[PDB]
Amino acid sequence: NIAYNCCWDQCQACFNSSPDLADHI
């Protein structure tokens, strides 16, 4: 399970799940 690291400005959010990553973004 790859943690989806958010490539948003200074937003280092790596979520292994699609819904959690989407919520965090």
Partner 1 sequence: MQIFVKTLTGKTITLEVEPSDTIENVKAKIQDKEGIPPDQQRLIFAGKQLEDGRTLSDYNIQKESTLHLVLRLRGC
Are 21 and 4 a contacting pair, CB within 8 Å? Answer: yes
Q: How far is the CB of 19 from partner 1 (least distance, A)?
A: 5
Nearer to partner 1, 12 or 18 (CB): 18
Instruction: List, comma-separated, the residues after which the chain is broken, a break being a C to N distance over 2.5 A; otherwise answer none.
Output: none
Q: From the CB of 15, what's the least distance to partner 1, in Å?
A: 12
CA distance 3 to 21: 8
> Rule CB under 8 A: which residues touch partner 1?
18-19, 22-23
For the bound state, the minimum distance from the C-beta of residue 22 to partner 1, rounded and expressed in Å, comes to 6
